[PDB]
Amino acid sequence: PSFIDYFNGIYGFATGIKDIMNMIFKTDTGGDLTLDEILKNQQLLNDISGKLDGVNGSLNDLIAQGNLNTELSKEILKIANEQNQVLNDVNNKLDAINTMLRVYLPKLTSMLSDVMKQNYALSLQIEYLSKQLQEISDKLDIINVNVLINSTLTEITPAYQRIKYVNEKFEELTFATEDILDELTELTELAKSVTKNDVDGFEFYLNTFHDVMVGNNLFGRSALKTASELITKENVKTSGSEVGNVYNFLIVLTALQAKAFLTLTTCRKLLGLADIDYTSIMNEHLNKEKEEFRVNILPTLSNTFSNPNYAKVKGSDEDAKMIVEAKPGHALIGFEISNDSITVLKVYEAKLKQNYQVDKDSLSEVIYGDMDKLLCPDQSEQIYYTNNIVFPNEYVITKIDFTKKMKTLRYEVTANFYDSSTGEIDLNKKKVESSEAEYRTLSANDDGVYMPLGVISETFLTPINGFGLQADENSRLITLTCKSYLRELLLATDLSNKETKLIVPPSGFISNIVENGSIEEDNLEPWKANNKNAYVDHTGGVNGTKALYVHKDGGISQFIGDKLKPKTEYVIQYTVKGKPSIHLKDENTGYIHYEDTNNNLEDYQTINKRFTTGTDLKGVYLILKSQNGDEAWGDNFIILEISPSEKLLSPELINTNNWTSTGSTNISGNTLTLYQGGRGILKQNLQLDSFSTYRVYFSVSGDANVRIRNSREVLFEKRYMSGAKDVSEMFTTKFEKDNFYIELSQGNNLYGGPIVHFYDVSIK
Amino acid sequence: PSFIDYFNGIYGFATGIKDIMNMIFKTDTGGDLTLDEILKNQQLLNDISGKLDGVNGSLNDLIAQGNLNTELSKEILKIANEQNQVLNDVNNKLDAINTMLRVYLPKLTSMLSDVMKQNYALSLQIEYLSKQLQEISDKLDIINVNVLINSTLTEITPAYQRIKYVNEKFEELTFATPADILDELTELTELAKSVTKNDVDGFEFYLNTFHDVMVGNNLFGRSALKTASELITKENVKTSGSEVGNVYNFLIVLTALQAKAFLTLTTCRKLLGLADIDYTSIMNEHLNKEKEEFRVNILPTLSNTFSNPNYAKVKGSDEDAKMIVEAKPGHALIGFEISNDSITVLKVYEAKLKQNYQVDKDSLSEVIYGDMDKLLCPDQSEQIYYTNNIVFPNEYVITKIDFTKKMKTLRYEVTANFYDSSTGEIDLNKKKVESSEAEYRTLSANDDGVYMPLGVISETFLTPINGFGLQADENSRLITLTCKSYLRELLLATDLSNKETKLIVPPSGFISNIVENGSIEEDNLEPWKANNKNAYVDHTGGVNGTKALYVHKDGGISQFIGDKLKPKTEYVIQYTVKGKPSIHLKDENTGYIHYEDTNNNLEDYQTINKRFTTGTDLKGVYLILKSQNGDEAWGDNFIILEISPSEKLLSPELINTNNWTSTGSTNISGNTLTLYQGGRGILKQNLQLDSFSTYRVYFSVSGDANVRIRNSREVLFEKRYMSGAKDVSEMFTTKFEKDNFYIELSQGNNLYGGPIVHFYDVSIK
């Protein structure tokens, strides 16, 4: 589960905790004593009143039982009235204490609830970031332990254990809370053990945690440094960059510390103790850790991130192409390639606001499906022009083309100028391509090639500065490495202690049209059941969800006709169990776009297909029934709009009307003829792109020589000599694109009479 | 944050804390055994007692004066007895509370006020030294180390953390010191109960283990001092001091930790009214054992030389200049500092000595020099650094260091005056050493500037300088100034012998500046002043945590500094400012404008530093900070330094036409020399050259010639230019000679008759 709200940085929740601490302090419960002192005085007055009241009762009873004289009874009544006045004063004080305690208890419960509210509001972010931390930690099963790591762990685990224990137990008890003192026994014990001055108390371990993190030890290193060196390992394959991962680590550390200080203040207030204002110390710790990370950690980190995983794939080698394009004001900020059933690529766009921030409102998601065929070949070889583009700062990638001509993979990137101060991207473009001199070829192999997979995006969505593809032929690996502006955004917003705003890449598809596809909201306001059957089976679904179910003949339907397009391709996906039947059906007209029937899926199976739409569209809706009369239940309904893929157009270039001939040579329609004995040649000027590839076709008879070259560089040249029946040849252009020409020639002396012929000479 | 005050060494704060502990012992609390007596119930218990005593007295009078004698009277006796029990409990509680409030509270509040007042200065000193030691430790590497270093760290980290935290917490809770006073006393008593509780892992246990690790009584006989010295002595560690000073600073920090820990322990045991133990004996034993360990097993194996900590790329014109870093009569050089914030500047500290090389705080003059980058660095034409480490004997203190950059070479001459160890007077008995000739090193011409030294060149505490050396690395193009100190002797004589120690610390601030309150830290601008009701002290502004001067409309903040100046002497101005300021050093009389800085759209704080000269009446000059036109701007860190004048190089001509001892057929016509072919004649001229100096000989020769500048037994230069000798300038040195040097212009041939050879403009410069 991911959160769509901003993250606000460490400064964000630091200021939040400061506000909560101010809220705790401003409250004036009693302002006279503490809880323990209140209860001690309560017991004191209880015992005093009990003894005095027993005495007075005994006196009154034994004097009323037998009255003897006038003066004796008079003085007895006088002293009894005086003692009763004293008892009334004692009882007044005791009732004042009782009222103080009765206004104390509920006030403290309300304060703890108000605390826990914002504490839980914050805890979700650190929960997701700690989940990512655990994901990166699982990869540490192959990194052997070093003396540095051993020492840092043995030094930090006690303080960390104690701080985590205190925080989690305080949260647990404050949640369990929602006389009362008998119920607050555990909370009071915790507050008394946490606010206790001791040689090895809680504040001691907090301070030593900070000192071992920032590195204020006499002869100790900063634990942030060792943690970054551990995270920044080559064997560890994570989704984001190194800046992002060490930033997540710093986030979890500062969150632990801030929650600890908050629990400390809340416990002090619960016990009625004085207010110490730990805001200053918390800010000192957090800011010192931030400055450590900024000065001695961040500069030596990489801001480039690649794909974490690969997948064996086979892609048709038939001239593929795609164009990951952003809108005029939008930019590219992240990718994700999924290869469960279909090889889909989601791309995130967004408007920028300032200091490379990402506008959450404008966050859009585009889909592509040509990655399989593009990146990986099926049977016959492949070529990739490996070159990591690196645009300068202030430029953000907006368009990334992939043009697979014959068997090459060439890509061109463009970066628009982004003003850092403002959030606008002007139409000042810098175009780079994959240089020629450095290409790498994957040989034809029966098994599939390893295509990138997973999330290619910074831990927090940010603009992309550079793009590159790499290929390894020894292992047939492919990697897509991008470059982000996270260092700049951090140094500008969070490491300068200013307002931060960040977005985390979500796990699901934002663009999917089917609302409540996962069916997590128990109320099916989007969906609906026609007949009194087919309901929400909570036990079913993708483990912890609420699946849609069908029994007899009543199918659950959802209207999604409007949010579609005509003839545009779409991708359907859904997990189901039993014998289901899914149909994307239109009420008007009997057109059936997607239909899935007859699937004895005893266990949950994930079906993913592609289709097209062609109808009125406005009257279309999704339907889930049961095959014939059986029962079945599904979940995770997804319908994605994949962007149309453009077909690579190939101009003929060569035309019979552009054959500059010299000497005895004749061009008849579509045939060329060079006569032996003459010094003639057929030169033709061409217009070739910069770093493109081209394919020349010839059908030649006789001895011939052909050279496609420039004045100072030659792309292709060959004398086929006797045999030249038919030949197709690939040739590249490199950084040239100027004054290129083809020469059909044959230089000999006393060869007269015979001739050489060319047919179907073409550049495609 | 330095402090200009005699840092009395371990002996100092040791005896101070011993006195404080004895005073704490002398404090009398009495019967303060009722700690679990809430003092905030005095009024309640007093009211209850005052209201119950009346009833008790009424019952007593009834049973006494009353004539009733019956079991009724017996029951009345029982009732009175129960009321008396209640009253007696209330009165016992009230009496305990009153005693604790009128005997136990005033004594302790006074005692703790005194404890804190005395700990103030010790805390200041030890906090500065702790900052320095933490910088050093940051400059350390502990990744790849032995088993002994690892064991010492394992053994010393927990106790160190515990003791440091406990000291800081006790200091905070004491400074904390009505319901607030009693709550703070409750916090102090909780901390005291935790510190003094009977467990094997108590504060005392950690103190004793800290001592055992400092002395070497651990598993491996490895004292923490030995690992500290081994880690600080490595080549990678570059600090502003020697190994002696750095390990002594380590010892100071840790012994101060221990002493303050013993003080907190005594204060806690007294606050809880516990049996006294007299930790003064244990404190003295620990500190003396650790000082003895340092003196015996650590100090002898340390080097008392300190070099430059940092380097900076810098260039310098090939123009020749002479500099004389000297100390006034009776003074001595005790430290330097090369700062290149904006321009290269050299602070030099001079002070009179008192005894055992102790520096006098009162006499701590500071001089400034500005021609260090133009002297230590070349611009575009190579450089020759003469490198030799001088080492004077004991009782001799450096007073003058003279750099003479005659040509493209660098060489220095040091002078050391005799110093009496017993008294504090430095006689005028001088020993002069120079940079030996045979060992010079050349930096080739390179477009990129050379790495000039930078940082504080001085022991951790200002001490006299014994020897000086310049070293140069050609491959790395580095330059280092390695000086030698007397800290070992000053310590063996004062501190490690348990005697009154007096140590000063490099102030880390241009004391020489004439702008009072330049940093503007004192909120009350008694020196400065505002003409109009505007331009005030912006506390939020300034170098992070300071109080900057501000200007808005047309009222500029001014400070009078006309007197403390000189006419035509060069000065350096420096100041940080934000906004659009306008700084002017203006004289009320005459419209002369010495320094003027206007039009600087410094949106962020920028540090402007410039040089200038003064020429006016001077007595009516003052500094002014206004805003350009009408904008606003605020600055801070105002500094005006008087740089010592630099002397220009005077190079004797030496060669005069009136001293040409000619032999054979040779003729000298005015400024031309002519040797006739066919004759056995030669032109010999005697010269007077200095010991370790360089000279440049210029010739314009026509014909075949040979020239040799040599002595009777050594030759400085010799060359036969043969056919072509149109013009030639040659550098030559003298080495350890300076006696009977002569130039010979000669050409030896047989049957060559008729032609001649001519020399012109032959000069030695």
Coordinates of N, CA and C in Angstrom, one line a residue, chain B residues 368-520:
Chain B
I368 N 50.7 41.7 11.8 CA 50.1 41.2 10.6 C 51.0 41.4 9.4
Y369 N 51.1 40.5 8.5 CA 51.9 40.6 7.2 C 51.0 40.2 6.0
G370 N 51.3 40.8 4.9 CA 50.4 40.6 3.7 C 51.1 40.1 2.5
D371 N 52.4 40.1 2.4 CA 53.2 39.7 1.3 C 53.7 38.3 1.4
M372 N 52.8 37.3 1.8 CA 53.2 35.9 2.0 C 52.9 35.1 0.7
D373 N 51.7 35.4 0.1 CA 51.4 34.7 -1.2 C 52.3 35.1 -2.3
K374 N 52.7 36.4 -2.4 CA 53.6 36.9 -3.4 C 55.0 36.5 -3.1
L375 N 55.3 35.8 -2.0 CA 56.6 35.4 -1.6 C 56.8 33.9 -1.6
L376 N 55.8 33.1 -1.2 CA 55.9 31.7 -1.2 C 55.5 31.0 -2.5
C377 N 55.0 31.8 -3.4 CA 54.4 31.2 -4.6 C 54.9 31.9 -5.8
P378 N 55.2 31.2 -6.9 CA 55.5 31.9 -8.2 C 54.3 32.1 -9.1
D379 N 54.5 33.0 -10.0 CA 53.4 33.3 -11.0 C 53.5 32.5 -12.3
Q380 N 54.6 32.6 -13.0 CA 54.7 32.0 -14.3 C 56.1 31.5 -14.6
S381 N 57.1 31.7 -13.7 CA 58.5 31.5 -14.1 C 59.2 30.7 -12.9
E382 N 58.8 29.5 -12.7 CA 59.5 28.5 -11.8 C 59.7 29.1 -10.4
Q383 N 60.4 28.3 -9.6 CA 60.7 28.8 -8.2 C 61.7 27.8 -7.6
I384 N 62.6 28.4 -6.8 CA 63.6 27.6 -6.1 C 63.5 27.8 -4.6
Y385 N 63.1 26.8 -3.9 CA 62.9 26.9 -2.4 C 64.1 26.2 -1.8
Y386 N 64.8 26.9 -0.9 CA 65.9 26.4 -0.1 C 65.3 25.8 1.2
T387 N 65.5 24.5 1.4 CA 64.8 23.8 2.5 C 65.8 23.2 3.4
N388 N 65.7 23.7 4.7 CA 66.6 23.2 5.8 C 66.0 23.5 7.1
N389 N 65.8 22.4 7.9 CA 65.2 22.5 9.2 C 66.2 23.0 10.2
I390 N 66.1 24.2 10.8 CA 67.0 24.7 11.8 C 66.6 24.1 13.1
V391 N 67.5 23.9 14.0 CA 67.3 23.3 15.3 C 68.3 24.0 16.3
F392 N 67.8 25.1 16.9 CA 68.7 25.7 17.9 C 68.7 24.9 19.2
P393 N 69.7 25.0 20.0 CA 69.8 24.3 21.3 C 68.7 24.9 22.3
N394 N 68.6 24.2 23.4 CA 67.7 24.7 24.4 C 68.2 26.1 25.0
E395 N 67.2 26.8 25.6 CA 67.5 28.1 26.2 C 67.6 29.2 25.1
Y396 N 67.3 28.8 23.8 CA 67.4 29.8 22.7 C 66.0 29.8 22.0
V397 N 65.5 31.0 21.9 CA 64.1 31.2 21.3 C 64.2 32.0 20.1
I398 N 63.5 31.6 19.0 CA 63.5 32.3 17.8 C 62.9 33.7 18.0
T399 N 63.5 34.7 17.3 CA 63.0 36.1 17.5 C 62.7 36.7 16.1
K400 N 63.5 36.4 15.1 CA 63.4 36.9 13.8 C 63.6 35.8 12.7
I401 N 62.7 36.0 11.7 CA 62.8 35.1 10.5 C 62.7 36.0 9.3
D402 N 63.8 36.0 8.5 CA 64.0 36.9 7.4 C 64.0 36.1 6.1
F403 N 63.0 36.4 5.3 CA 62.9 35.8 3.9 C 63.4 36.9 2.9
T404 N 64.3 36.4 2.1 CA 65.0 37.3 1.1 C 64.8 36.6 -0.3
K405 N 63.9 37.1 -1.1 CA 63.6 36.6 -2.4 C 64.4 37.4 -3.5
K406 N 65.7 37.3 -3.5 CA 66.5 38.2 -4.4 C 66.2 37.9 -5.8
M407 N 66.2 36.7 -6.2 CA 65.8 36.3 -7.6 C 64.7 35.3 -7.6
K408 N 64.7 34.4 -8.5 CA 63.7 33.3 -8.6 C 63.9 32.2 -7.5
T409 N 64.6 32.5 -6.4 CA 64.9 31.6 -5.4 C 64.3 32.1 -4.1
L410 N 64.0 31.1 -3.1 CA 63.5 31.5 -1.8 C 64.4 30.9 -0.8
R411 N 64.8 31.8 0.2 CA 65.6 31.4 1.3 C 65.4 32.2 2.5
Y412 N 65.6 31.7 3.7 CA 65.2 32.4 4.9 C 66.4 32.3 5.9
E413 N 66.5 33.3 6.8 CA 67.5 33.4 7.8 C 66.8 33.6 9.1
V414 N 67.0 32.7 10.1 CA 66.4 32.7 11.4 C 67.4 33.1 12.4
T415 N 67.0 33.8 13.4 CA 67.8 34.3 14.5 C 67.1 33.9 15.8
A416 N 67.9 33.4 16.8 CA 67.5 33.0 18.1 C 68.2 33.7 19.2
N417 N 67.5 34.3 20.1 CA 68.1 35.0 21.2 C 68.1 34.0 22.4
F418 N 69.2 34.2 23.3 CA 69.3 33.4 24.4 C 68.2 33.7 25.5
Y419 N 67.6 32.7 26.0 CA 66.5 32.8 27.0 C 66.9 32.1 28.3
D420 N 66.8 32.8 29.4 CA 67.1 32.2 30.7 C 65.9 31.4 31.2
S421 N 66.1 30.1 31.4 CA 64.9 29.3 31.9 C 64.4 29.7 33.3
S422 N 65.4 30.1 34.1 CA 65.0 30.5 35.5 C 64.2 31.8 35.5
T423 N 64.7 32.8 34.9 CA 64.0 34.1 34.8 C 63.2 34.2 33.5
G424 N 62.6 35.3 33.3 CA 61.8 35.5 32.1 C 62.4 36.5 31.1
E425 N 63.7 36.8 31.2 CA 64.4 37.8 30.4 C 65.2 37.1 29.3
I426 N 65.1 37.7 28.1 CA 65.8 37.2 26.9 C 66.9 38.1 26.6
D427 N 68.1 37.7 26.8 CA 69.3 38.6 26.6 C 69.5 38.8 25.1
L428 N 70.4 39.7 24.8 CA 70.8 40.0 23.4 C 72.0 39.2 22.9
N429 N 72.0 37.9 23.2 CA 73.0 36.9 22.7 C 72.3 36.1 21.6
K430 N 72.7 36.4 20.3 CA 72.0 35.9 19.2 C 72.8 34.8 18.4
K431 N 72.1 33.7 18.0 CA 72.6 32.7 17.1 C 71.8 32.8 15.8
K432 N 72.5 33.0 14.7 CA 71.9 33.1 13.3 C 72.2 31.9 12.5
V433 N 71.1 31.3 12.0 CA 71.1 30.1 11.1 C 70.4 30.5 9.8
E434 N 70.8 29.8 8.8 CA 70.2 30.1 7.5 C 69.8 28.8 6.8
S435 N 69.2 28.8 5.6 CA 68.8 27.7 4.8 C 70.1 27.2 4.1
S436 N 70.6 26.0 4.5 CA 71.8 25.5 3.9 C 71.7 25.4 2.4
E437 N 72.8 25.6 1.7 CA 72.8 25.7 0.3 C 72.6 24.4 -0.4
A438 N 73.4 23.4 0.0 CA 73.5 22.1 -0.8 C 72.1 21.5 -1.0
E439 N 71.1 21.8 -0.2 CA 69.8 21.2 -0.3 C 68.7 22.2 -0.7
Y440 N 68.6 22.4 -2.0 CA 67.5 23.2 -2.5 C 66.6 22.3 -3.4
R441 N 65.3 22.7 -3.5 CA 64.4 22.0 -4.3 C 63.6 23.0 -5.2
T442 N 63.4 22.6 -6.5 CA 62.9 23.4 -7.5 C 61.5 23.0 -7.9
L443 N 60.6 24.0 -7.9 CA 59.2 23.8 -8.5 C 59.2 24.4 -9.9
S444 N 59.0 23.5 -10.8 CA 59.0 24.0 -12.2 C 57.8 24.9 -12.5
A445 N 57.9 25.7 -13.6 CA 56.9 26.6 -13.9 C 55.6 25.9 -14.4
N446 N 54.5 26.3 -13.8 CA 53.2 25.7 -14.1 C 52.1 26.7 -14.0
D447 N 51.2 26.6 -15.0 CA 50.1 27.6 -15.0 C 49.3 27.6 -13.7
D448 N 49.0 26.4 -13.2 CA 48.3 26.3 -11.9 C 49.1 26.8 -10.8
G449 N 48.5 27.5 -9.8 CA 49.3 28.0 -8.7 C 49.7 26.9 -7.8
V450 N 50.7 27.2 -7.0 CA 51.3 26.2 -6.0 C 50.4 26.2 -4.8
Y451 N 50.6 25.1 -4.0 CA 49.8 24.9 -2.8 C 50.5 25.6 -1.7
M452 N 50.1 26.8 -1.4 CA 50.6 27.5 -0.3 C 50.1 27.0 1.0
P453 N 50.9 27.0 2.1 CA 50.4 26.6 3.4 C 49.2 27.4 3.9
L454 N 48.4 26.9 4.8 CA 47.3 27.6 5.3 C 46.8 27.0 6.6
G455 N 46.4 27.8 7.6 CA 45.9 27.3 8.9 C 46.7 27.9 10.0
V456 N 46.5 27.4 11.2 CA 47.2 27.8 12.4 C 48.5 27.0 12.6
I457 N 49.6 27.7 12.6 CA 50.9 27.1 12.7 C 51.4 27.4 14.2
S458 N 51.0 26.6 15.1 CA 51.3 26.8 16.5 C 50.9 25.6 17.3
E459 N 51.6 25.4 18.4 CA 51.3 24.3 19.3 C 49.8 24.5 19.9
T460 N 49.3 23.5 20.4 CA 47.9 23.6 21.0 C 47.9 24.8 22.0
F461 N 49.0 25.1 22.6 CA 49.1 26.2 23.5 C 50.4 27.0 23.1
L462 N 50.2 28.4 23.1 CA 51.3 29.2 22.6 C 52.6 28.9 23.4
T463 N 53.6 28.5 22.8 CA 54.9 28.2 23.4 C 56.0 28.8 22.5
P464 N 57.2 29.1 23.1 CA 58.3 29.6 22.2 C 58.6 28.6 21.1
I465 N 59.3 29.1 20.1 CA 59.6 28.3 18.9 C 61.1 28.1 18.9
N466 N 61.5 26.8 18.8 CA 62.9 26.4 18.9 C 63.6 26.4 17.5
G467 N 62.9 25.8 16.5 CA 63.5 25.8 15.2 C 62.5 26.0 14.2
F468 N 62.9 26.3 12.9 CA 62.0 26.6 11.8 C 62.5 25.9 10.6
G469 N 61.6 25.4 9.8 CA 62.0 24.8 8.5 C 61.0 24.9 7.4
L470 N 61.4 25.2 6.2 CA 60.6 25.2 5.0 C 60.9 24.0 4.2
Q471 N 59.8 23.3 3.8 CA 59.9 22.1 3.0 C 59.0 22.2 1.8
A472 N 59.5 21.6 0.6 CA 58.7 21.7 -0.6 C 58.7 20.3 -1.3
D473 N 57.5 19.9 -1.7 CA 57.3 18.7 -2.5 C 57.1 19.0 -3.9
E474 N 57.9 18.6 -4.8 CA 57.8 18.9 -6.2 C 56.7 18.2 -6.9
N475 N 56.6 16.9 -6.7 CA 55.6 16.1 -7.4 C 54.2 16.6 -7.0
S476 N 54.0 16.8 -5.7 CA 52.7 17.4 -5.3 C 52.6 18.9 -5.3
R477 N 53.8 19.6 -5.5 CA 53.8 21.0 -5.4 C 53.3 21.6 -4.1
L478 N 53.7 21.0 -3.0 CA 53.3 21.4 -1.7 C 54.4 22.2 -1.0
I479 N 54.0 23.0 -0.1 CA 54.9 23.8 0.8 C 54.5 23.7 2.2
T480 N 55.4 23.5 3.1 CA 55.1 23.3 4.5 C 56.1 24.1 5.4
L481 N 55.6 24.6 6.5 CA 56.4 25.3 7.5 C 56.4 24.5 8.7
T482 N 57.4 23.8 9.0 CA 57.5 22.9 10.2 C 58.3 23.7 11.3
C483 N 57.7 24.0 12.4 CA 58.4 24.7 13.5 C 58.5 23.7 14.7
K484 N 59.3 24.0 15.6 CA 59.6 23.2 16.8 C 59.3 24.0 18.0
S485 N 58.7 23.3 19.0 CA 58.2 24.0 20.2 C 59.0 23.5 21.5
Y486 N 58.6 24.2 22.6 CA 59.2 23.8 23.9 C 58.1 23.3 24.8
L487 N 57.0 22.7 24.3 CA 55.9 22.3 25.1 C 56.4 21.2 26.1
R488 N 57.2 20.3 25.6 CA 57.7 19.2 26.4 C 58.3 19.7 27.7
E489 N 59.2 20.7 27.6 CA 59.9 21.3 28.8 C 58.9 22.0 29.7
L490 N 58.0 22.9 29.1 CA 57.1 23.6 29.8 C 56.1 22.7 30.6
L491 N 55.8 21.5 30.1 CA 55.0 20.6 30.8 C 55.7 19.8 31.9
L492 N 56.9 19.3 31.5 CA 57.7 18.6 32.5 C 58.1 19.5 33.7
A493 N 58.1 20.8 33.5 CA 58.5 21.7 34.5 C 57.3 22.3 35.3
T494 N 56.1 22.4 34.7 CA 55.0 23.0 35.4 C 53.8 22.0 35.7
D495 N 53.3 21.3 34.7 CA 52.1 20.5 35.0 C 52.4 19.1 35.4
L496 N 53.2 18.4 34.6 CA 53.6 17.0 34.9 C 54.4 16.9 36.2
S497 N 54.8 18.0 36.7 CA 55.5 18.1 38.0 C 54.6 18.6 39.1
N498 N 53.3 18.8 38.9 CA 52.3 19.3 39.8 C 52.7 20.6 40.4
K499 N 52.8 21.6 39.5 CA 53.1 23.0 39.8 C 52.2 23.9 39.0
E500 N 52.1 25.2 39.5 CA 51.3 26.2 38.9 C 51.6 26.3 37.4
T501 N 50.6 26.0 36.6 CA 50.8 26.0 35.1 C 50.1 27.2 34.5
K502 N 50.6 27.8 33.5 CA 50.1 28.9 32.8 C 50.2 28.7 31.3
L503 N 49.1 28.5 30.7 CA 49.1 28.2 29.2 C 48.0 29.1 28.5
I504 N 48.4 29.6 27.4 CA 47.5 30.4 26.5 C 47.2 29.6 25.3
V505 N 46.0 29.9 24.7 CA 45.5 29.2 23.5 C 45.5 30.2 22.4
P506 N 45.8 29.8 21.1 CA 45.7 30.7 20.0 C 44.3 31.3 20.0
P507 N 44.2 32.7 20.1 CA 42.9 33.3 20.2 C 41.9 33.0 19.1
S508 N 42.4 32.6 17.9 CA 41.6 32.3 16.8 C 40.8 33.5 16.4
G509 N 41.4 34.7 16.5 CA 40.7 36.0 16.2 C 41.7 37.1 16.1
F510 N 41.5 38.0 15.1 CA 42.4 39.1 14.9 C 42.3 40.1 16.0
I511 N 43.1 39.8 17.1 CA 43.1 40.8 18.2 C 43.7 42.1 17.8
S512 N 44.6 42.0 16.7 CA 45.3 43.3 16.3 C 44.3 44.3 15.7
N513 N 43.1 43.9 15.3 CA 42.1 44.8 14.7 C 41.8 46.0 15.6
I514 N 41.5 47.1 15.0 CA 41.3 48.3 15.8 C 39.8 48.6 15.9
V515 N 38.9 47.9 15.2 CA 37.5 48.1 15.2 C 36.9 47.4 16.5
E516 N 36.7 48.2 17.5 CA 36.1 47.6 18.8 C 34.8 47.0 18.5
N517 N 34.5 45.9 19.1 CA 33.2 45.2 18.9 C 32.9 45.0 17.4
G518 N 34.0 44.6 16.6 CA 33.8 44.4 15.2 C 32.7 43.4 14.9
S519 N 32.8 42.2 15.6 CA 31.8 41.2 15.4 C 30.4 41.6 15.9
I520 N 30.4 42.7 16.7 CA 29.1 43.2 17.2 C 28.4 42.1 17.9

